[PDB]
Chain length 29, copies 3
């Protein structure tokens, strides 16, 4: 249970970082 | 305390999915 | 360990909220 939650947060963090970079691209055309 | 952090992570996953849908709509629509 | 996961989840929430803000700015120009 605990190990799954930790892994879920690590996945979220990767996904958020990618989304930040994709927004930055869109911001700039 | 456990349930509260589980719910938080599920809510962040839901939000991130909604944010990616809106990004796709902005980029392509 | 629990306190570090809770800190990480709060940081992801803050991040996500920033990204939602920035997507809404792009949706309006
Ligand atoms: Ca559970
Ligand atoms: Zn651990
Ligand atoms: Zn710039
Ligand atoms: Zn707590
Ligand atoms: Zn796309
Ligand atoms: Zn396209």
């Amino acid at each position: 249970e605990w190990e799954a939650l930790e892994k879920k947060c690590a996945a979220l963090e990767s996904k958020l970082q990618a989304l930040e970079k994709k927004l930055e691209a869109l911001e700039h055309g």
